[PDB]
Design a protein around this ligand. Structure first.
Ligand SMILES: CO[C@@H]1[C@@H](C)[C@@H](OC)/C=C/C=C/CCOC(=O)[C@@H]2CCCN(N2)C(=O)[C@H](Cc2cccc(O)c2)NC(=O)[C@H](C(C)C)NC(=O)[C@@H]1C
Length: 163
C-alpha cells in the first residue's frame, strides 16, 4: 500500500537506468504524497526533465529543481513551502530518500538520495522514502559528481511516474 515511484535516469541524454523508490506514506503521508504527485505530473508540474544539480560521491545526490533549474528553485503541491511533517525516520544508510530545505518548515520539491549513512542529518531533514531497486544506478550517478558537488555531465530524470 506504500506507493512506489520510478525515475528513468539519463546521462547527457543517454539512458543509464531506472531507480525506483518506496515512499513511506504510512509514516509521512503528506511528504510522501508531495513526492508521489510530483513524479506523475498530475499537478501540472514536476520532476520530469529536471536534473540532479548536486552530487557528492559518498554523501548524496540532490535534485528536484524544476522551476529554475539552477538548484535554487522548486515548489511543493501544497503551495511554495510546507512543514517538516515529522522526524520519525532516520538517515540510516545508502538509498535513503529525504527532503532538502532552506530551514525549518521550508520543504518544496528538492530532495536527496543518500549514498551513505548520514546520521548528522537526522532531525534536520525529513526522511520519507528509500530506494527500492536501482541502487546500482545511483552509484553509477556518483561517478559524475565531485567532492564539491558540481556534476561533470547532465544527469537528468528523463521520465518518472508511479509503478
Ligand atoms: C543553492 O542552494 C543554496 C545553499 C543551500 C547552497 O549554496 C551554494 C549551499 C550548499 C551547501 C552544500 C554542502 C553539501 O550539502 C548539501 O548539498 C545539502 C545536503 C542535504 C540537502 N541539502 N543540501 C539542503 O537541504 C540544502 C541546505 C543544506 C546544506 C547543508 C546541510 C543541510 O542539512 C542543508 N538546501 C538547498 O539546497 C536549498 C534548496 C532546497 C532551495 N538551497 C538554499 O537554501 C540556498 C539557495
Amino acid at each position: 500500500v506504500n506507493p512506489t515511484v520510478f525515475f528513468d535516469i539519463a546521462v547527457d541524454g543517454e539512458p543509464l537506468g531506472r531507480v525506483s523508490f518506496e515512499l513511506f506514506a504510512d509514516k509521512v503521508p503528506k511528504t510522501a504524497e508531495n513526492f508521489r504527485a510530483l513524479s506523475t505530473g498530475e499537478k501540472g508540474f514536476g520532476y520530469k526533465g529536471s536534473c540532479f544539480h548536486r552530487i557528492i560521491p559518498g554523501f548524496m545526490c540532490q535534485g528536484g529543481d524544476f522551476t529554475r533549474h539552477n538548484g535554487t528553485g522548486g515548489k511543493s503541491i501544497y503551495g511554495e513551502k510546507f512543514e517538516d511533517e515529522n522526524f520519525i525516520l532516520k538517515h540510516t544508510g545508502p538509498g535513503i530518500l529525504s527532503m532538502a530545505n532552506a530551514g525549518p518548515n521550508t520543504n518544496g520539491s528538492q530532495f536527496f538520495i543518500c549514498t551513505a549513512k548520514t546520521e548528522w542529518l537526522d532531525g534536520k531533514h525529513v526522511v520519507f522514502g528509500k530506494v527500492k531497486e536501482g541502487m546500482n544506478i545511483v552509484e553509477a550517478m556518483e561517478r559524475f559528481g565531485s567532492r564539491n558537488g558540481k556534476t561533470s555531465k547532465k544527469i537528468t530524470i528523463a521520465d518518472c511516474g508511479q509503478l
